[PDB]
């Protein structure tokens, strides 16, 4: 992955003119610094390996966190799967229009002790359950629901004190690639919903406790971390400049191009 | 010389005395769809002479305080002859595109336009909590124009049309990453874009998905000394390439 | 059970790991590939595309288009300075929010030569000559046309080709430089000077303009990815 180097030159004077170009044709010129001044023939050994698409993307990042309280009615958390709730990853993925990649998933779970009232509480080890529901499946509504059977729905059980769990999901989409932008409506009358929210139908995620409220309540907190593999991208995009506003849409407030200086000649 | 192009498709031809080179997409040419790629169970149709001719939209007048105009591309041709007929009668379809914008003036005027085409161009509403209606996104073969100021918040469903943010909240200086061309009145006279079909799905319905958007932004304001013609228009010419259809259903 | 010892460094979670994981979709059938035009495969393909830099930052043009226009008019005397700004593609605000400046904000280290394309968007009957000068650091910013010609420069004359390019070469004591502002790895300044005046005939406006572009050459390389300081988020988007 070695970058090319430059070659020496001699003093030249002819009407072969590389320096004068025409940018009106929409073509970036391919001049070399060996054509504007005399240079030395240098060996070069830099690479562009750390600038590939995979090294730019295959690094994990948090996308969401949620809580739930043990000693409560319907203490259980849910979250619709989307990647436009955190400003760091959403801004990174909006550099490309069409993405097709493999996905890897990890979790990390902490806990906390609630201000209870019982005397000399001491809890055993707690375990947690994460169940994925494909779009169209049944829904849970309480902590002891028959939806938690996990008959066919893939799920995982995890214990505190051990390593964080990890699973891997292959490329699941109706089309050929995930799309970061969709300019259209759902209805053929061109009404109602407009934007990326129409395609965003991938399922939901439910977390819940396994054990019971023994004597004192416990509030936990999970965090979900995405990490892509085998990435392929198409149609690069200029980066998002202004701040993000919403998740279902792409609305924005107007802002200047950059911060300003005091003069056009100042330094 | 290299200044002269001659573009002929079907029954209509466009020639020009001087213009720059033609910029062709992302390096490919528009093609028909091969058997290994298809998912339509039925055989498509190809009119291919009744659709691969040129069309002309409504011309707009370039003024001094002009902000910029746009069109949603496979929507403004929905009344343009048999292509407008064939768009109404099918369920699927994919098209290529050739775009040729032209605007002429004397050697005594000044100004430099920018013509870029963007695939998958979302917009933003005035009120942040809503999305704008259909009629503000495009007109039938007419231009929607930008403003050099900020659209207010009191409006319900209107597109925020601040020029320096381009409606998508990006920096307009970075817009040249898409295939673009320049029209400088000092040396150039017209621009030519050739674009292939860009989508995640090999075919699409055209009524509820605009996969291409054309934008024209004046960086340098049009300037002239007194005595020349003050009324200068801008015309566009759009012709599709190798289009086809599937799923014959009623008219809508 | 094989006799093995747990090495230090297990049961950890690294932000940039690389391992294999058991799948959750057993024998999933993936949708086949598709020949989508414009497949990028390295980040330096974006970094070669030029972009218009907002030079005219005079505190009111940033919410306009006039930040990109560089005002050029006919004078009476000679030797004026058109503009000037330091060359730091990750530190200066002028080259910050441009496309090359944005990719550079995702890293720390960089090297390579930088092109500077200039287009004269004036009349056809206008004519002028210019001195596009670059100076390496070590002294101050040059102050006259005589001082700038001792640097590395080119004398662009407008003609039928209404474009020109400057290529500032890579002159550094180190193999790479920081994108963060520092005394130790400064890069010098770029200035543009009126070589002659601007010749205009009668019945022409005397106020022309020039546009600017900025791109990298083929020797460009970055290193040591970091997290960008531009966007910031407090609560969740919904």
């Amino acid at each position: 992955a070695r970058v090319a180097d430059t070659i020496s030159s001699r003093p030249t004077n002819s009407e072969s003119i590389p320096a004068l170009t025409a940018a009106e044709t929409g073509h970036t010129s391919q001049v070399v610094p060996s054509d504007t001044m005399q240079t030395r023939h240098v060996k070069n050994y830099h690479s562009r390996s750390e600038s590939s698409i995979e090294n730019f993307l295959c690094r994990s990042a948090c996308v969401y966190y949620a809580t739930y309280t043990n000693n409560s009615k319907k203490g259980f958390a849910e979250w619709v799967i989307n990647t436009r709730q955190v400003a760091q990853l959403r801004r990174k993925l909006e550099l490309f229009t069409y993405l097709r990649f493999d996905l890897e998933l990890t979790f990390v779970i902490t806990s906390a002790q609630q201000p209870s009232t019982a005397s000399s509480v001491d809890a055993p080890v707690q375990t947690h359950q994460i169940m994925y529901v494909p779009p169209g499946g049944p829904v849970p509504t309480k902590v002891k629901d028959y939806a938690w059977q996990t008959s066919t729905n893939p799920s995982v059980f995890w214990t505190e004190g051990n390593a964080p769990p990890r699973m891997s999901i292959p490329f699941i989409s109706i089309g050929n690639a995930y799309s970061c932008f969709y300019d259209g409506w759902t209805q053929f009358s061109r009404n109602g919903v407009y934007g990326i929210n129409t395609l965003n139908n991938m399922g939901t995620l439910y977390m819940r406790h396994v054990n019971e409220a023994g004597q004192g309540p416990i509030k936990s907190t999970v965090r979900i971390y995405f990490k892509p593999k085998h990435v392929k991208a198409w149609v690069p995009r200029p980066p998002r400049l202004c701040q993000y506003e919403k998740q279902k849409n792409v609305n924005f407030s107007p802002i200047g191009v950059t911060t300003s200086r005091t003069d056009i000649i100042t330094t | 010389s290299d200044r002269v192009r001659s573009i002929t498709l079907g029954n209509s031809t466009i020639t020009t005395q001087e213009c720059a080179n033609v910029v062709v997409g992302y390096g490919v040419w528009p093609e028909y769809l091969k058997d290994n790629e298809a998912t339509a169970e039925d055989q498509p149709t190809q009119p291919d002479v009744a659709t691969c001719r040129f069309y002309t939209l409504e011309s707009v007048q370039w003024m001094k305080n002009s902000a910029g105009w746009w069109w949603k591309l496979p929507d403004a041709l929905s009344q343009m002859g048999l292509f407008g007929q064939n768009m109404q009668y099918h369920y699927l379809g994919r098209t290529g595109y050739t775009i040729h914008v032209q605007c002429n003036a004397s050697k005594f005027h000044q100004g430099c336009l920018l013509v870029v085409c963007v695939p998958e161009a979302e917009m933003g509403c005035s009120n942040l909590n809503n999305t704008p209606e259909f009629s503000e996104l495009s007109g039938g073969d007419s231009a929607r124009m930008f403003t050099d100021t900020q659209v207010g918040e009191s409006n319900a469903k209107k597109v925020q049309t601040a020029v320096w943010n381009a409606g998508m909240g990006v920096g307009v200086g970075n817009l040249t990453i898409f295939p673009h061309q320049w029209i400088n009145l000092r040396t150039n006279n017209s621009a030519t874009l050739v674009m292939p079909y860009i989508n995640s799905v090999p075919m699409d319905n055209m009524f509820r998905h605009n996969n291409l958007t054309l934008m024209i932004i004046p960086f340098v304001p049009l300037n002239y000394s007194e005595g020349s013609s003050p009324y200068v228009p801008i015309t566009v010419t759009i012709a599709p390439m190798c289009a086809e259809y599937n799923g014959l259903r009623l008219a809508s | 059970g094989l006799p093995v010892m747990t090495t230090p460094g297990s049961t950890q979670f690294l932000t940039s790991d690389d391992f294999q994981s058991p799948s959750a979709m057993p024998q999933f059938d993936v949708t086949p590939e598709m020949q989508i035009p414009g497949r990028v495969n390295n980040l330096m393909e974006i970094a070669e595309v030029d972009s218009v830099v907002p030079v005219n930052n005079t505190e009111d043009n940033v919410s306009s288009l006039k930040a990109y226009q560089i005002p050029v008019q006919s004078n009476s005397d000679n030797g004026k300075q058109v503009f000037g700004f330091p060359l730091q593609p990750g530190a200066n605000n002028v080259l910050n929010r441009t496309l090359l400046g944005e990719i550079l904000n995702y890293y720390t280290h960089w090297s390579g030569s930088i092109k500077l394309t200039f287009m004269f968007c004036g009349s056809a009957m206008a004519t002028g000559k210019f001195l596009l000068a670059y100076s390496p650091p070590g002294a101050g910013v040059p102050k006259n046309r005589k001082d700038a010609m001792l640097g590395t420069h080119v004398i662009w004359d407008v003609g039928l080709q209404s474009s020109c390019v400057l290529c500032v070469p890579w002159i550094s004591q180190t193999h790479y430089r920081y994108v963060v502002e520092d005394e130790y790895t400064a890069a010098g300044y770029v200035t543009c000077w009126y070589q002659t005046n601007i010749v205009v005939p009668a019945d022409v406006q005397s106020s022309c303009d020039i546009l600017c572009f900025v791109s990298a050459c083929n020797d460009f390389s970055v290193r040591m990815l970091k997290d960008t300081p531009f966007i910031r988020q407090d609560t969740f988007y919904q």
Partner: antibody
Framework: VQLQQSAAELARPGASVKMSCKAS????????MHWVKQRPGQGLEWIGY????????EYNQKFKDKTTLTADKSSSTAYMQLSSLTFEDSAVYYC???????????WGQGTLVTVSA | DIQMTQSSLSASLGDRVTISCRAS??????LNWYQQKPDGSVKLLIY???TLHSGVPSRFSGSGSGTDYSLTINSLEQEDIATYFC?????????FGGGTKLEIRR
């Protein structure tokens, strides 16, 4: 990061006053800035906002004629200038920063503006 | 304009309290809950119907859907004795609720 208002003032009925909202700890030109008004026996009322990147103002329909929202990029502060002061204006004023979507995260300390004879 | 109706509540230490406010029409779950301290400081607790801000205790919780929405504190303490407001974020312009004071029982 915090928002710093000025002190309390007093003015003749019909006169004008100008307060300040000193912003520090964050980049000034990025985010917007608003102004609300709370009468002491009432709730809260929104007045208007001002984008310092473009100097664009927009009021509520109750205060379309009176207030003037000004801000300068240098000192990173904003001024809310009231005109034709009456006894309705005897209230407490806050300046606040609008969130990512619609919330108000950072709030100033509040100042008291009274009119009397 | 969206009308925001909401008045004065008293309760003792460590009990479960609730505050409820409704709108004029449906707001589709775009609600916030603020707290104005007795000295004159203002902070944000729940930036949605249920999701707490970072840095506040977990004693607070909010619920409700459609028109009717409720803010609940499970255990009352001294630092919580202030007023609280609800504010819509759906339509221009932003309308705030009325005051709702808290105080000791006896």
């Amino acid at each position: 990061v915090q928002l710093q208002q000025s002190a309390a003032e007093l003015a003749r009925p019909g006169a004008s006053v100008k307060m300040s909202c000193k912003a520090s700890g964050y980049t000034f030109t990025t985010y917007t800035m608003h102004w609300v008004k709370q009468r002491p026996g009432q709730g809260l009322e929104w007045i208007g906002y001002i984008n310092p990147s473009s100097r664009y103002t927009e009021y509520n329909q109750k205060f379309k004629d009176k207030t003037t929202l000004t801000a300068d990029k240098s000192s990173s502060t904003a001024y809310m200038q009231l005109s034709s002061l009456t006894f309705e204006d005897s209230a407490v004023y806050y300046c606040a920063r609008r969130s990512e979507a619609d919330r108000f995260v950072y709030w100033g300390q509040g100042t008291l503006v009274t009119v009397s004879a | 304009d969206i009308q925001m109706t909401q008045s004065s509540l008293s309760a003792s230490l460590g009990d479960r309290v609730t505050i409820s406010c409704r709108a004029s029409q449906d707001i589709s779950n775009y609600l916030n809950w603020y707290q104005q301290k007795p000295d004159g400081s203002v902070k944000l607790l729940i930036y949605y119907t249920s999701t707490l801000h970072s840095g506040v205790p977990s004693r607070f919780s909010g619920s409700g859907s459609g028109t009717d929405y409720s803010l609940t504190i499970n255990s009352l303490e001294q630092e919580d004795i202030a007023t609280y407001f609800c504010q819509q974020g759906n339509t221009f312009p932003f309308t705030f609720g009325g005051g709702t004071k808290l105080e000791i029982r006896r």
